[PDB]
């Protein structure tokens with residue numbers, strides 16, 4: 039009867055806010071399974087659930103490690119209703135710093151969670167939706183998935199990957215009645231460092247002095263972009279709802295038009311020369 | 324004196340042809356290190372080298388596994404000249420089939436070689452080029468790195484990833500005098516299956532009958548696109564040379580204009596609705 043929704047990465051940010059937005063919806067039409075990698079981080083979720091007074095049984099927490107298919111299979115199994123009407127692939131890791139300063143482990147982790155982890159969720163949940171000829175999948179994208187940002191080389195690699203992943207799939211799913219949609223967010227309030235980097239001593243030991251200088255410049259710039267452009271996760275969460283209510287969802291939703299013009303010069307110069315120059319002066323003056 | 328060039332994935336295709344194109348250049352200005360994952364596959368390379376009469380000492384073969392940084396460090400070490408003037412990140416794996424039918428291992432492998440393997444090469448070789456304030460990096464892209472293709476979900480994920488990887492880096496490298504360039508190839512002659520898939524019994528056991536039907540349709544279509552549009556690796560290899568001779572290289576080179584219009588409707592409809600529909604009818608009629 040209710041729309042069963044399964045969301046990944048609900049310890050914070052978009053995922054946590056989206057879970058509570060849905061479970062507490064005045065209409066009581068959503069049954070929400072908020073998954074989290076470690077159950078010890080579930081308190082912020084329950085505290086938000088109490089604030090928005092989610093009624094008993096509208097929200098459940100599941101431990102789900104997207105880097106593990108047995109974990110993915112186990113949470114799938116936990117879906118009491120026997121079907122998921124809306125799957126939200128939200129789990130994600132950030133990674134910021136000079137390429138040469140990133141640990142191999144850190145690099146592999148990011149793609150394993152952002153990319154292979156989404157592939158796992160889709161392998162486990164699409165089969166059933168295709169069968170029923172129904173279901174919606176929302177994947178949280180990023181402006182960094184649409185244009186390259188310096189010092190976010192690997193993060194962007196993973197976000198650009200999701201675009202390719204979802205776009206290829208969408209061309210196939212079109213006739214199965216299964217809708218997949220990317221929600222492209224610009225910066226969103228509630229974070230730290232920006233994503234994840236190392237101490238300046240760590241980064242200095244791992245890079246040249248000039249790249250180290252550039253990094254600082256990028257960080258100062260990003261901090262200002264967040265200050266003047268960051269959105270409340272409440273406003274971003276509502277975009278996920280606009281997408282899931284669309285009788286005919288598009289492949290892509292943007293939570294803001296703020297980056298569209300920059301996305302435009304990128305789109306209008308296939309060679310990438312205009313964007314690289316524009317983004318260079320935009321960050322490094 | 325000579326331009327030291329190190330190329331990855333030279334057992335076949337673009338990499339093999341590019342190595343011999345350079346080593347045999349009438350000007351004898353390139354010193355080429357052609358790397359290969361397994362040295363047992365080096366015969367096609369030496370046979371091509373003899374056909375184009377590469378002079379003694381213009382070409383050397385190195386075993387390099389991009390999935391292993393110790394292997395990456397060892398080949399770096401083997402560069403007798405102590406510098407690489409041109410790095411060509413060419414090594415790549417394809418992967419074709421319904422998402423649900425791909426092995427987790429196969430999925431992780433593809434991103435490990437196409438994405439993390441390129442990250443490894445760049446971590447190992449960029450530092451020195453940045454220091455000298457010179458060097459060129461050419462990365463072999465794909466039309467699948469610019470637009471999603473059905474049944475190539477993971478392959479596209481990895482090719483789209485490289486775009487994000489190289490684009491972020493380019494915005495940073497601009498002032499270090501280091502040039503990075505993606506060479507976007509459409510289909511190129513000398514392949515098998517298209518990239519890599521499983522036997523129809525394997526794929527049927529792993530997917531629904533309708534998706535199985537769609538796959539066949541995609542395969543028939545791709546085979547026709549190859550037949551009518553595939554380029555000789557000789558013509559594709561020359562584009563790498565156009566890029567490396569450009570006094571001011573752009574971020575992106577296209578080996579053909581054949582897919583630009585389709586790339587256009589993709590660029591002109593940010594929501595992705597036009598491209599998904601256009602590509603759907605293009606493949607599945």
Ligand SMILES: NC(=O)c1ccc[n+]([C@@H]2O[C@H](COP(=O)([O-])OP(=O)(O)OC[C@H]3O[C@@H](n4cnc5c(N)ncnc54)[C@H](OP(=O)(O)O)[C@@H]3O)[C@@H](O)[C@H]2O)c1
Nearest residue numbers: 047048049050051052053074075076103104129130223226
């Ligand atoms: N933060 C921003 O400024 C911003 C901007 C644009 C787009 N976004 C996007 O939104 C997503 C999440 O960002 P957010 O902080 O706003 O929300 P979020 O819901 O906190 O997503 C990040 C989450 O990933 C989860 N995660 C980490 N490792 C995991 C693993 N192995 N398995 C499963 N889940 C794992 C974490 O909690 P769990 O314990 O639940 O797993 C965490 O909640 C990303 O995909 C990102 O592109 C965020």
Ligand SMILES: NC(=O)c1ccc[n+]([C@@H]2O[C@H](COP(=O)([O-])OP(=O)(O)OC[C@H]3O[C@@H](n4cnc5c(N)ncnc54)[C@H](OP(=O)(O)O)[C@@H]3O)[C@@H](O)[C@H]2O)c1
Nearest residue numbers: 332333334335336337338359360361388389414415508511
């Ligand atoms: N084939 C096409 O139709 C086509 C079309 C468009 C773009 N391209 C692009 O060109 C690249 C190569 O395709 P190609 O067949 O034309 O040329 P290629 O030079 O044969 O590249 C594929 C190569 O990857 C190498 N490789 C596989 N695993 C590796 C590993 N672990 N470590 C290092 N190298 C590994 C293989 O030989 P080694 O033993 O040398 O390593 C193989 O030669 C890809 O990145 C692809 O995007 C090809």
Ligand SMILES: C[C@]12CC[C@@H]3c4ccc(O)cc4CC[C@H]3[C@@H]1CC[C@@H]2O
Nearest residue numbers: 180181182223224225232260263320
């Ligand atoms: C990549 C993000 C969107 C694009 C943002 C951006 C966009 C443009 C720009 O000039 C700088 C930055 C810095 C912070 C970036 C954000 C950090 C988190 C978010 O996902």
Ligand SMILES: C[C@]12CC[C@@H]3c4ccc(O)cc4CC[C@H]3[C@@H]1CC[C@@H]2O
Nearest residue numbers: 465466467508509510517545548605
């Ligand atoms: C992805 C590739 C470029 C784009 C090609 C394409 C492009 C358009 C299209 O309608 C179908 C195909 C099938 C084969 C694809 C190719 C297979 C190898 C190559 O890299």
